[PDB]
Every structure is written in C-alpha cells, then in structure tokens.
C-alpha cells in the first residue's frame, strides 16, 4: 500500500544498510534467507512490512533496496555473508574501480559508468510499488562514491521522479575525528550540488556516537558495528510509523513538511534516547519525561555540536512502545518551559509528535539494553551553522594553496566549480545567520 | 423520519468515528457483526437515523470513511466493529496528506473528492428525509483540515438547506502535535466559518485535563479521549433517536444556539464524569448535573468560559427527570451567575430532556455552550499564524501546491474579523 525504497551508496551506506536490514529482519521475523517461520499467508495480505519487503515467488520476502558501490569489496562482503540469500542478486550493483575519496571521480569519471544501471534498477523497483512515498539514501559526506555518486543519483532521481520525498541519512564530517585528508572538498562540493535536489538530510556524526558509546553505553572501544547498529536504531525509529501502527502515525512526507522551514535549510540533527547499557538498565525508571529530557541534553546529540549555541526551528519527537500521550504532552510542555532550550520567535509551535506501539527490538549480541519505550528526536536547529562554518574554514585553508585541486581538475572537474560551491556555502551560512535573528 | 449521514476524514477523524460507531452500536444493541441483539423496542424504533438496513436482518452504519492514506483505514477495518461498515464506503487514496493543507485541499483531496462525493450522493439517495451531515475531523492535520473543508464546501453547494455539523479537534494552547498547526487551522477556519451550521470545538489539552483532574486516570490513551468525544456526539443527537419529555433535534439546536450566522463555534461538555473511587461518594441528582455542566474545568475546549460571556446555551438531559427541577436549576444558574451571560438575550439556556439515559448511567446531560470566550482560541491561532507568516516559515510547502500569499492574507483577515465580532458582542 505504502512502499519505501532504500538506497545505500558507498561503503558507509552499505554497512549501515547491513545493520538496518538485520534489524528489519529481526523486527519482522524474516529469516536471513527471506523465509518466514510464521508464513501463514503467502501472496498478499498485511503484513505491514510490505513497505520494505516485496512478496516474490511463494513465501519469500526481498528487501526494496539497491546497494551501490564502485569497488566490489564491501558488496562482496554482502554477497558472501549471512544475508547473501536475502537480497535480489541484481540489486547489489558494483563497478570495478573505486572513487579514491575523489568527488570528481565518483561524480563524472566513474559515476557516469553505472548511474544508468542504478537508475534502471531503481525504476524496476519503483514500478513494483503502488504507493511509493519516497527514497532513503544512505551515504557519507567526506567520502568518494558516497559523495559524488550520491549527488549524481540525487540529481537523476529529482529529474525522474520529482515529487517523491528524497530523504538522506548522511555521515556528517566530524569536527576533530576524520578519515580522509580531502574531506572538506568532497563535503563542500556534495552540499553545493545536492542542496536543491534533496528534501531532508538527517545528520549523524561518528565522533558524537563515539562519545555516546563511551559515556552512556559504557563501551570504551566500540567499532564501526556499534555505530552502525545505533544508526540502524535511529532508522527503525524513523520508519516504524510506516512499518507499525500506533496512537499517532507519521508518514515520510510529514517529516519534510514539519522539519524544513525553508527550501535551503533541511539539515535536522538525529538524536536517540534512551541509550544505556544492560548493567544500568535495572537502576533507572525510563519514564516518558526522563527520555524526553535526555533527548535535549547536549551530551546526547548524534552530531558533535552544541544546541545551546543556536535555536530550534523545528523539532520532531517520535515515540515508540509503552507510551501514554498525556505524558508526552506534559513532557513537551516542561521542555517548552525551560529557558535553556531556545526556539526561534517565528515558530511558536515548535514540536511535531509521533507515537508508535512497537517497542524497540534488541539485536541479539547488541549493546543497548531492552527498554519499554524510546524516543528518536529529529531537530532542525541553527547550531549546525557552526559546523558549516568549520567546514568552510577548512575548505578555505585547503583551497587557498590549491592543495589537491589537480586531483579533481584532472578528472573532469572545472576549477570554477570549487569557487561556485564556496560561494553557495557562504550564502548558506548567511541563511543560517538570518533565520536566527529575532524580529 | 429524520436521517443522518456521517462522514469521518483524517486519522483523528477516523479514530473518533470508530469509537463513535462503537458507542452508537452499543446504544442500539447492534453487535460487531451488524446483527440486532437488543432488549428494548425503542432501540429499533428510530434505528434508521444512523443505520441502513441491508436485507437479511443486518444493519449497516450510514458512515463514509475518507483519508489520503490507507493505514488508518486498515487499522479501523481490522479492529473491533471494523466488519460493520460497508466495504464500498472506504474511500482512500495512496499519496498521503503530509500535514499540508494546500496538498490535501488542492491536489490529493481534489483528486479524491469526486469519488467521495459519489459515495455521499449514493448514501443520500437511500434516505427518506435527510436531516443533515456530521463531519468528524481535526484542524491540525492535512487530510482532516483540507479534505474536510473541501467536502463541506462541495456538500454545502449540493445541499444548501441541510444541517452541516462538524466536530473539529482544534489546536492546543500548550503543545502542538504539528509544527504548521497555525497555517492549517487558519485556512480551515476560513472555510468552516463560511460553510458550516455549527462547529464543536474539541481540544486534546482540555480532554487530558478532564481525564486527569476529574476521572483520575493515571494512563489515559486516545481510547478514552475519543470515548469522551463519542459520548458528546451521542448526546447531541439523542433527541432524534429516543423519545423524551422535551425534544430538540439538530435543526432546533442550531436555531436556538446560533444567534448570528458566523458565531456558531461551541464548547461541548458532559456530565457526570467521576472516577471509580469517588463514585460511591457522590449522589447523582439533577442539581449535581447542572453544577458539573456549567463548570470551567469541565469544558472540552481549552478556553476558560469565565473570560467571556455566553450568547446561547444548550443543555440536553437524558434519563427520567422532572421538568421543574431542570428548569429551576437552569434559572438558578442564570440568576446567580448573571454576569457571564449577555444582557441582550433573555433566557439564554434552552433545555431538552430525553427518557433514555446512556448505557450504564441513571441519567446524564450534554452541555453545548456558545460563549464569546472562544475568541481566545482564535486570537492565539491568529497570533501564531502572523508570527509564522511574517517570516514565510514553511510557506513554500503551500505555495508550491497551487496556493499564493493572497489566500493566506484573506484567511488571516477572516480570522481577525471573527475575533472582532466575538469581542464586539462581549
């Protein structure tokens, strides 16, 4: 009835997709080979998981996902792993050479070789839908494929579909921790090119999740798997309203309607609570008010920034499980009372509420404790202007010397595109400065 | 004799309508399968007000379900009493509203309104004498606000002399459940004030206050708020279904309640409401019903009636009572608290007494107050609308669907004119 297509671009996208699809199969009881042990009805019915899983053959559920990568390493990890029989063999699309953390490669040189194949696969998936709401694109800014090919695919999908919601789950470049030396270039170019072709891009940060795993989960040494599982919990909290009925449902279009005040400001920060280990779970009364208050703690934000340095323009609180709406009402009123949580004057109604019935599902061998309820906050705040200014300063420092510029110019990039992207980023910084002014 | 067509639009509208039909089917002894298993002839004497008889000793609610997303309709169809509705009346699209008035009113609701109106006309042709329509919807969402206002306009054009009643869930003064509630609320009032006969203002904030302070409910879900709203809905049209000492149907209620064509926004109430613990300590008398009715903390609209003045008051009682006791209580209320009534209307309160109490009660009474204190709701909505519109916040989501700034300006002007009128008569 209502379908959603997930697109996983780059290594980060594919790994987060592995985590998300493990969590989906756990929540819906789908075996790793697509079979269902309680498969009483075959060939129809509801079975609300038709949003992400399509019924094929006789008693097999195939994810509505396209995995895209330019090198075969990660997709081959997928092709020979636990869920090799889950995905359609043609949904796992690979090139032959990586983008080498080069936006120019993944956008012009290499992305042009498989963009048509990816779009044809996406078209084949979309033709099997009757109520396709939108797409979910998982990627990272500071990467190669996940930046250049992500922007190219966003442009092509904006051309082909147009009015379908285009949501992104992006790994924002951390302010201190980093992987690539040329992350500012790729991040600025991606932001410039995919800005007007995206509806809502959810921001997460590896450094903030590191800090959350250290402080809250009591994990001194987490790997990328723990980060991927937490991001998967966030994704499941976002899509649970589609996959499960609740007291107050929120489809995907309501996110872009409620969280995006202006067409150029669509970067809401992800936040999840409660995130606690199993040891301290027995010593806390995880009430609605406690989790609602923990959602606004500066130490619990999934992006390394300080919300107290800015104002909230739009906030979305998605509750799950044993949640009473009166308690949500009271907790949000208490939040509005606090003077340390500043909202813009031009948004007197600042919250959007969603309440589901399905409690969070514990992944076997996971980190998070079994809780009765959880809240995922998607807040659009002006505090991300500081992160954008930091990225702009790094970009300026690297570009004033023309460092690494030849690596992009020799791949089909015209040098003026750097200047154009930088001017647009300055304009975006001015946008964020202007919306934060009370008048 | 008189028959009503029920239309429920939106997620909130569908939930409230499902609870309403559960309560109504319980009142008339209609089990979840449509079979009649009552114990009084009065249950079948006037059952055609809400039920079409499908030959085979089964009754079908004269209800039409409208939504732009099939999820709420699936939940309604699968739940209890979901098998009692006619399958042809589930008129839904596939796109979804997205809490956008522009979308749900000009694109998706416009694509679906033709089928919805076909179903409406089919239901209207099967009646002996159409009394009017009831619309159950919320003013904050996209399907509710836009779709319901579109349907109201269409039906008012097709049926200009029928009773158009709406039971609208209005935005709350403390916590909004949608970031763009001011826009949708203003654009919906701009149509409601022009096309409806009477609108009942229900606010979830006041319902939570009732459930906590009065009913002493630790964990009230929407299954209880919707039950309160359904109790109000059933008490409104009880004179059309069961006999009584003094009858007052929808037409006479609208006549007595609306002094001027634009001031038709009411504050519903209900009594008695007691917790299970305090139930053994309260004697149930007509003075107790009267005292609990005219109570600011008992209003289902989050507007204190003590900040305004009553234009007209409806008090529909149910159960075996004395006309003299009810009239004496009404007169005592009017005399002792005369400063809350407009001096240019004598005998503000119009009463009605039905002989059949609600299920499980000895007697009850539904309060319908038309107070000038409702201007607080519109002042707050207009302030929020202006604060958001001066900066074009979330405005592109509505201008990209076919609307322009002129329409928002006209809606704001109409809202402010309604505010000015309500203040003029205070």
């Amino acid at each position: 009835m209502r379908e959603c297509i997930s697109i996983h671009v780059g290594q980060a996208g594919v790994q987060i997709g592995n985590a998300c699809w493990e969590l989906y199969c756990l929540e819906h009881g789908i075996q790793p080979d697509g079979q269902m042990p309680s498969d009483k009805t075959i060939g129809g019915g509801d079975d609300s998981f038709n949003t992400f899983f399509s019924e094929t053959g006789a008693g097999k559920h195939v994810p509505r996902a396209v995995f895209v990568d330019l090198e075969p390493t990660v997709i081959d990890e997928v092709r020979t792993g636990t869920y090799r029989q889950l995905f359609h063999p043609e949904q796992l699309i690979t090139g032959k050479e990586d983008a080498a953390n080069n936006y120019a490669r993944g956008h012009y040189t290499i992305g042009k070789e498989i963009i048509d194949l990816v779009l044809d696969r996406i078209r084949k998936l979309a033709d099997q839908c009757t109520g396709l709401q939108g797409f979910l694109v998982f990627h990272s800014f500071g990467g190669g494929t996940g930046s250049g090919f992500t922007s190219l695919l966003m442009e092509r999908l904006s051309v082909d579909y147009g009015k379908k919601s285009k949501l992104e789950f992006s790994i924002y470049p951390a302010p201190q921790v980093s992987t690539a030396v040329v992350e500012p270039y790729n991040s600025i170019l991606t932001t410039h090119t995919t800005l007007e072709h995206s509806d809502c891009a959810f921001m997460v940060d590896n450094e903030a999740i590191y800090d959350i795993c250290r402080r809250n989960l009591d994990i001194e040494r987490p790997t990328y798997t723990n980060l991927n599982r937490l991001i998967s919990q966030i994704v499941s909290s976002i899509t649970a309203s589609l996959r499960f009925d609740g007291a107050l449902n929120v489809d995907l279009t309501e996110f872009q309607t409620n969280l995006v005040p202006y067409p150029r400001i669509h970067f809401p920060l992800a936040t999840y609570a409660p995130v606690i280990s199993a040891e301290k779970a027995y010593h806390e009364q995880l009430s609605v008010a406690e989790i609602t208050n923990a959602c606004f703690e500066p130490a619990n934000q999934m992006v390394k920034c300080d919300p107290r340095h800015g104002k909230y323009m739009a906030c979305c609180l998605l509750y799950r499980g044993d949640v009473v709406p009166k308690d949500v009402n009271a907790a949000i009123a208490t939040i509005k009372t606090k003077r340390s949580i500043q909202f813009v004057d031009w948004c007197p109604t600042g919250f959007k509420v969603g309440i589901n019935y399905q409690p969070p599902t514990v992944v076997p061998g996971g980190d998070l404790a079994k809780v009765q309820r959880a809240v995922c906050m998607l807040s659009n705040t002006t505090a991300i202007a500081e992160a954008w200014a930091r990225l702009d300063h790094k970009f300026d420092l690297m570009y004033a010397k023309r460092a690494f510029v030849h690596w992009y110019v020799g791949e089909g990039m015209e040098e003026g595109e750097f200047s154009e992207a930088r001017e647009d980023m300055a304009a975006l910084e001015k946008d964020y400065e202007e919306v934060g002014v009370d008048s | 004799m008189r028959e009503i067509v029920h239309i429920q639009a939106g997620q909130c509208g569908n939930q409230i309508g499902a609870k309403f039909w559960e309560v109504i089917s319980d009142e008339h002894g209609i089990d979840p399968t449509g079979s009649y298993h009552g114990d009084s002839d009065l249950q079948l004497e006037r059952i055609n007000v809400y039920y079409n008889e499908a030959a085979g000793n089964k009754y079908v609610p004269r209800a039409i379900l409208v939504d732009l997303e099939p999820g709420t309709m699936d939940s309604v169809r699968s739940g209890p009493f979901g098998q009692i509705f006619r399958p042809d009346n589930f008129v839904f699209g596939q796109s979804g509203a997205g809490n956008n008035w522009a979308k749900g009113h000009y694109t998706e609701g416009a694509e679906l309104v033709d089928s919805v109106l076909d179903v409406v006309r089919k239901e209207s042709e099967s009646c002996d004498c159409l009394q009017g329509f009831q619309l159950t919807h919320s003013l904050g969402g996209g399907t509710g606000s836009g779709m319901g206002t579109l349907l109201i306009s269409k039906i008012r054009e097709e049926y200009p002399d029928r009773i158009m009643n709406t039971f609208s869930v209005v935005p709350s003064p403390k916590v909004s459940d949608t970031v763009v509630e001011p826009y949708n609320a203003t654009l919906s009032v701009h149509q409601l004030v022009e096309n409806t006969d009477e609108t009942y203002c229900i606010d979830n904030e006041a319902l939570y206050d009732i459930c906590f302070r009065t009913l002493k409910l630790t964990t009230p879900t929407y299954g209880d708020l919707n039950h309160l709203v359904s109790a109000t809905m059933s008490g409104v049209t009880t004179c059309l279904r069961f006999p009584g000492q003094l009858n007052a149907d929808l037409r006479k209620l609208a006549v007595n309640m609306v002094p001027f064509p634009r001031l038709h926004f009411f504050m519903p109430g209900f009594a008695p409401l007691t917790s299970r613990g305090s139930q053994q300590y309260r004697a149930l008398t007509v003075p107790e019903l009267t005292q609990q009715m005219f109570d600011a903390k008992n209003m289902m609209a989050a507007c204190d009636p003590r900040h305004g003045r009553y234009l007209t008051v409806a008090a529909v009682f149910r159960g075996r009572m004395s006309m003299k006791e009810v009239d004496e209580q009404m007169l005592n209320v009017q005399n002792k608290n005369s400063s809350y009534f407009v001096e240019w209307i004598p005998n503000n309160v119009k009463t009605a007494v039905c002989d059949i109490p609600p299920r499980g009660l000895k007697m009850s009474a539904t309060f319908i107050g038309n107070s000038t204190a409702i201007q607080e709701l519109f002042k707050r909505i207009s302030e929020q609308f202006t604060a958001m519109f001066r900066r074009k916040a979330f405005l592109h989501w509505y201008t990209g669907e076919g609307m322009d700034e002129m329409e928002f300006t006209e809606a704001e002007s109409n809202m402010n004119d309604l505010v000015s009128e309500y203040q003029q008569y205070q």
Binding site: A426, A427, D431, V435 | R390, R391, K392
Partner: peptide, 12 residues
C-alpha cells in the same frame, strides 16, 4: 555574500 532564502520579503 547575500542570503538566498526570502525570510524578510514580507516582514509586515
């Protein structure tokens, strides 16, 4: 550099 969103176009 100038901003691009029209947040002040109808500040009336």
């Amino acid at each position: 550099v100038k901003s691009k969103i029209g947040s002040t176009e109808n500040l009336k």
